[PDB]
């Protein structure tokens, strides 16, 4: 039990100077301070000063303890036992000191110690805390519950784990009791503690569920913010876990939450507003809320107004917090919009008229925000009003207030689809014009919005942008020489998208001369170790695909570096996997973007890439990439494989027997994108192998057939599954034809909804081949085939004839009148397609 008078005065004076106004004495004394951390006796002084030295002032005492806390955050593995126990002993004995600063300091010590040493190393803590909970003195009980809150906040799953037993069996009923304590501060702690176990649906709470709801309900109208706040969090969380026990009280909950969404306390308001988001997700919502709508919308729409503090912090990275009342309200509107569709328009429209034109800009802004927020869910019933609203918004892009120009960009972008479905001179042309001006706006936030809006518009406009390319590139490349860094991400996006939308139309010497110099500038000046390459190479993978042979001037150095990036990454992984202590783990993103650039490189160049592939280790590398533990890396490698298979199969063919085992084991639909690119690859390969695919059919086909009949499977994955089955059937009809029955339905349903293209052509040659081989595969579901055949606008002649031989085949097989009875199912446009295009 050592104080030591020599060492005592040495630290007391070193604590003094660590409170000095100037940094010169501060930073040198802090250096000279925790460098005394070498001694195993040092941290004992610190607790002693905090708890046992009454002769010293509280600021000094408090600080000494906080330094001791910072000596557990870092340097706790090097803690001696007797020290640790003695600090633990002095804390629990003083957990509720009469001085609030000392009480709080001792508080956070207990919180950090019991955090760093998980909670096997203080098994005396929890039982002693629950004991100190029934304490006759307030300060002790307040101090205990306060540590119990932080502990619950830090180690919820650790307390629900087996690692310390299941002490929640007794703590849940214990906390619930203090819901009725007369102090507001205690009640707060109690609900906060219980709140930490709602989501994980902790069993200890689920048997006390009703008495939990009861206690909470009795606390709902508590006048103390913190309590109201914590009740709101609980009710909200409880919507996701125990919606059964909330349904009978639902209308009372919602009415309460409306009273709470406009709470006089900002925190409560925000926590209440969460309710509408969560509720919006439950399938019940659609009919439980209809009656509350004319009261909810105005509450949301008023919350979407910029809180005046936002105005000044907007107009370092000048940004508001991730999560606001405004944002939450806007989010809830967007989700409710998607739940009610047009049925929400009567509730909102009157408000829009009032807001959009309003003279105060803060109000106008929120109107434009609303207009964008409802855009997705309320689209079909918004269209009638759009020939007036768009030209209005286009004018607002010139409003003097920057934040108005901001959302106007966004809101227009949310109606981009409609805009392009119109004669371009009246809506698309002027929108584009003002957006281009705005991309170069003096305001950072406006550029961000304008550039994004333009990107959205480009996806929607496509080739309708071709005539305007000279102007577009001019401003995009200028922005390139101006845009800071955050905005550069968006700008790269806008260019890649440009290229994706216009494709080959970008391949003109005048456009290349504009677009390429600045990208090469960026290229040459960034180092291989620099993460600014990510958005660059990603951008280039789009530009290369679009430029096609216009890219030849640049292709070799580009191909050269991508292979290097892939090689330096794999190599770094093995020097890490065999020697973690010496070599650091590589960032796999370098490898991803390099694979991706290689992709768009094979796609833009086709057969011209072959010489670059022949004199490279790309295949050997790719084969390693396809085995990476990271799915995103497998994903990119399969896309590249599909591409090279198309570009230069002669260099891939030797590897097929090696590749196919890997592709075959990556048809797990839990990994959507990996599965997708594997399936696409298997397809392209099969076209190149021809009859030689025969060995692999039994290895993949049934996986594909399971996937295509699997519910809740994304539509594009379904699409490539359909394509690849088709392509496997084209080359191995004998092997694939017998499954005809098992895939024809979703195959047709999937492929009837895609544009006529080469892959669609590829797949239908297959389905046709399999049909002439196994006609009985389609007999039972021939209607699906007819509808899929009809989904074609302009089929090639031979394909059109193949469709025709088969249709007449069955008509002339089943009979004259037999066809009529079967054709009576056809919707009008179908019955009339087959008769006009194929002669029934």
């Amino acid at each position: 039990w050592k104080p030591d008078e020599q060492g005592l005065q040495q630290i007391l004076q070193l604590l003094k100077e660590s409170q000095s106004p100037d940094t010169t004495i501060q930073r040198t004394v802090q250096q000279k301070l925790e460098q005394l951390n070498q001694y195993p006796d040092f941290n004992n002084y610190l607790i002693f000063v905090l708890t046992k030295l009454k002769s010293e002032d509280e600021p000094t005492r408090s600080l000494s303890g906080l330094i001791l806390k910072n000596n557990v955050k870092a340097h706790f593995q090097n803690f001696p036992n007797g020290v640790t126990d003695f600090i633990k002993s002095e804390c629990l004995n003083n957990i509720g000191d009469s001085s609030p600063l000392i009480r709080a300091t001792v508080g956070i010590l207990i919180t950090t110690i019991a955090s760093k040493g998980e909670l096997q190393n203080w098994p005396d803590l929890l039982p002693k805390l629950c004991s100190l909970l029934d304490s006759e003195d307030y300060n002790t009980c307040e101090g205990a519950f306060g540590a119990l809150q932080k502990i619950c906040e830090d180690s919820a799953e650790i307390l629900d784990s087996d690692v310390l037993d299941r002490p929640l069996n007794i703590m849940i009923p214990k906390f619930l009791q203090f819901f009725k304590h007369s102090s507001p501060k205690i009640r707060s702690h109690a609900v906060a503690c219980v709140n930490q176990f709602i989501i994980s649906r902790t069993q200890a709470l689920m048997l006390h569920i009703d008495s939990f709801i009861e206690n909470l309900f009795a606390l709902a109208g508590d006048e103390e913010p913190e309590v109201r706040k914590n009740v709101c969090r609980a009710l909200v969380m409880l919507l996701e876990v125990r919606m059964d026990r909330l349904l009978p009280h639902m209308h009372n909950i919602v009415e309460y939450m409306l009273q709470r969404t406009q709470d006089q306390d900002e925190n409560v308001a925000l926590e209440a507003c969460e309710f509408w988001l969560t509720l919006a997700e439950q399938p019940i919502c659609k009919d439980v809320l209809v009656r509350h709508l004319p009261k909810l919308i105005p509450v949301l729409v008023n919350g979407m107004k910029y809180s005046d503090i936002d105005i000044i912090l907007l107009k370092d990275d000048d940004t508001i917090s991730d999560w606001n009342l405004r944002k939450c309200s806007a989010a809830a509107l967007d989700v409710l919009a998607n739940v009610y569709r047009d049925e929400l328009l009567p509730h909102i429209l009157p408000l829009l008229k009032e807001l959009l034109f309003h003279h105060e800009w803060v109000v106008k802004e929120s109107g434009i925000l609303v207009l964008g927020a409802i855009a997705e869910g309320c689209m079909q019933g918004m269209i009638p009003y759009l020939p007036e609203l768009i030209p209005h918004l286009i004018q607002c892009l010139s409003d003097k207030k920057a934040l108005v120009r901001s959302i106007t960009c966004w809101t227009l972008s949310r109606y981009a689809h409609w805009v392009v479905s119109q004669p371009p001179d009246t809506y698309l042309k002027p929108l584009m014009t003002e957006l281009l001006k705005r991309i170069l706006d003096s305001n950072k936030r406006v550029q961000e919005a304008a550039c994004s809006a333009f990107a959205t518009l480009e996806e929607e406009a496509c080739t309708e942008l071709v005539p305007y390319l000279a102007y577009i590139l001019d401003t995009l490349v200028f922005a390139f020489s101006k845009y800071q860094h955050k905005n550069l991400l968006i700008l790269y996006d806008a260019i890649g998208t440009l290229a994706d939308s216009v494709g080959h139309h970008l391949n003109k010497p005048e456009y290349i001369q504009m677009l390429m110099p600045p990208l090469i500038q960026k290229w040459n000046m960034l180092k291989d170790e620099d993460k600014d390459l990510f958005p660059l190479l990603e951008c280039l993978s789009s530009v290369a695909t679009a430029l096609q042979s216009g890219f030849l001037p640049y292709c070799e150095p580009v191909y050269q570096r991508c292979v290097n990036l892939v090689q330096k990454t794999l190599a770094q992984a093995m020097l890490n996997n065999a020697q973690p202590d010496q070599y650091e783990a590589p960032d796999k993103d370098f490898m991803i973007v390099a694979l991706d650039l290689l992709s768009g490189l094979a796609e833009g160049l086709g057969g011209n890439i072959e010489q670059l592939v022949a004199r490279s280790n790309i295949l050997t590398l790719m084969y390693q990439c396809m085995q990476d533990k990271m799915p995103e890396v497998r994903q990119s490698s399969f896309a590249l494989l599909g591409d090279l298979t198309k570009a230069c199969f002669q260099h891939v063919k030797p590897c097929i027997a090696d590749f196919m085992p890997i592709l075959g084991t990556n048809l797990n639909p839990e990994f959507i994108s990996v599965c997708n690119n594997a399936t696409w690859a298997i397809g392209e390969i099969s076209i190149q192998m021809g009859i030689e695919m025969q060995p692999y059919i039994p290895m993949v086909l049934h996986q594909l057939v399971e996937i295509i009949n699997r519910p809740n499977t994304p539509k594009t994955l379904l699409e490539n599954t359909a394509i690849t089955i088709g392509r496997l059937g084209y080359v191995c009809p004998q092997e694939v034809a017998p499954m005809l029955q098992q895939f024809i339905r979703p195959w047709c349903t999937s492929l009837r909804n895609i544009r006529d293209n080469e892959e669609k052509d590829s797949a239908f040659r297959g389905i046709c081949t399999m049909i002439s081989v196994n006609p009985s595969g389609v007999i039972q579901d021939f209607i699906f085939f007819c509808d899929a055949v009809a989904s074609w606008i302009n089929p090639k002649d031979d394909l059109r004839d193949m469709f025709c031989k088969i249709l007449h085949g069955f008509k002339n097989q089943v009979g004259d009148e037999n066809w009529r009875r079967f054709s009576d199912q056809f919707p009008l446009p179908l019955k009339e397609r087959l008769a006009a295009f194929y002669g029934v």
Partner: peptide, 12 residues
């Protein structure tokens, strides 16, 4: 994949 501007997000 997020990079484009949004005044709010549906999934925070």
């Amino acid at each position: 994949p997020r990079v484009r501007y949004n005044p709010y997000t549906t999934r925070p």
